[model samples]
Target: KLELRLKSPVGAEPAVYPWPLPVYDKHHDAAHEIIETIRWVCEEIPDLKLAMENYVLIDYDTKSFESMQRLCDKYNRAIDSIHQLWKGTTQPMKLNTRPSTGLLRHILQQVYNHSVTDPEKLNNYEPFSPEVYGETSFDLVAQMIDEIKMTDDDLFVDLGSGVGQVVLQVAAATNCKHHYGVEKADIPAKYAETMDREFRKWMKWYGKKHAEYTLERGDFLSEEWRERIANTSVIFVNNFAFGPEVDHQLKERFANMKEGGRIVSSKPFAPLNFRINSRNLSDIGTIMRVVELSPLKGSVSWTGKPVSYYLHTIDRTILENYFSSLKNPKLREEQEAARRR
Candidate 1:
């Protein structure tokens, strides 16, 4: 039987303390060896941080994850164990939960925990200093934009573009013919136009010609966008704030793309080990299975409410992989037909 012990947080200070004596003199050296082994193992594997203390004793006869499938199976089993423990003890309360101000507090606390614990993720956005020109790292994205080859005749489309950060960056970097921003929200669309104008003004002040760009106000998931994107070779879908309706529609639209056309999103949504299904793609992905995680938006000095947004990228392979499981084989055939022609 496994027992959990909660350590007290009261006045625990760092001080030199002597080690406790072992229970058996014969086992003392063996126990000390195990402790050193665990320390060495933990240092070598970063992902083992959470499971470091939860060590299990295996007979010396067994080998460690010898086969690749065995390693994957072990990870799956560990995830299943955690889920069973979570459900058995905590699921009933979740079912009867009601929406209240207390819920918001709980959500905020979750956000705080994610921000503090995941230093690797947080570091990608950090230093939290003066007002930079953007929210998501435009510098990193610009490098990606530079790598994408597009002709002067090709158009770049950004779906769910927030305030035109991506639109402006791609336009400035790629110099593609007439970049377009498709946004449904009036305020963000207007802000995108403002940012576009600012970029143009900056270009003009420096005696540079601004690449042609247009901000269109429409639902990207609509048939209207389907026609707009028809001839485009390269498409960009920033998965930030995309809903299920949008995801389905986007996949459908992109399926119509020519075989060589490509689509990329910053934060790509991938499969997870959870059984519960979400109503929207906003609610899917690995992050949602464990806890609520979201993009960091707004001013550098302050944080905003948790927005349901995700990141993803799709190419021909991803597109093929995504629609492979469609209930109707005819639908897949039709998509493949579009790709071939």
Candidate 2:
């Protein structure tokens, strides 16, 4: 029987699959990942391109061991060239530049697949509870990297962070001052400890640098988080499984956030179109500008479709402007008078 063996460029253990390559997510089948990884390495080491230029795909339904073995040998040789170049010579790979989004996903998946050896353990939590953990997929996080527009000045936080994947990805891709992941669950929190180690190890293996990040084991509603949330400029939460009670507590925490701070969530903590009228001025929606965002295509579901998430920005101007208008009826009348004239 023919088998597909994919050799990791970083000298990790090879991944082997049956004749027909398995699909990991969307177009991210085993074949796609193997090719993608090599192409990225080629960008850093132009010489590797010559070795891989003649590699043939294993796409035919009728395949033979001899052909597949030859293909694997070709890739293995390309990898050998990498090690030879690195043995005592200058590391030909780009050491200063950060990884591209697609490459970053591959690296993170490798880190995750290796670190979380048993994902079956994450489901050990209480059923139907707020602590029921779910992953905010990589593609969705990449979309957030664009929507959030994080900068060096921003301090980022991930509430109910599972295995700290979101935190790590965001920190790696952006220059956020510091990224924080807070997990209250026991199983996932413990796994995050391993994730921390694996992430550092893998990033170094790939010869790239990631921004500073911290993973903490604490409830987001706690006093420490209250203070941290207030200071954080960007907050991400996979609140899809969060109950109203917990979300209520979170809304309280968000109210303390400084102006211009933003929150991205699987669901909105506030309404999309919030009108700051006197009757409902106490609601968190009054102080925030919220918009529902359709996620970028290919978020790794079986169907490869994206779900909606919300973006909430702390803008007190809505409340401030409302109060200003109320305190000066004559000025409001002049504002209306300009429209009539």
lDDT of each: 0.44, 0.73
**lDDT, model 2:** 0.73
The clash numbers for all candidates, in the given order, read: 5, 0
Off by over 4 Å in 2: 1-40, 53-76, 79-91, 123-136, 298-306, 331-341
Put down candidate 2 lDDT per residue, 191-289, tens digits, no spaces.
889889878876765667899899989998888888999999999988876788999999999999998999998778987876655468799998899
Task: Report the lDDT tens digits of candidate 1 across residue range 1-341.
Answer: 21111111111221111223122222222233333323332332333336533353332212222332233334334434544555675431122121222222222222222122222322123223102323334433544554566678677887766455566666655647778888786665655565555455433322223467787788887777788776666677656445766666666676566645656554344443433222322333312222222434443322343222222323344323444534579875765566567
lDDT score for candidate 1 against the true structure: 0.44
Which window of ten consecutive residues has the lowest lDDT sum in model 2? 125-134
Task: Pick the TM-score winner.
Answer: 2
Best by lDDT: 2
Ten contiguous residues with the weakest lDDT in model 1: 2-11
Error of 2 at 320 (Å): 1.3
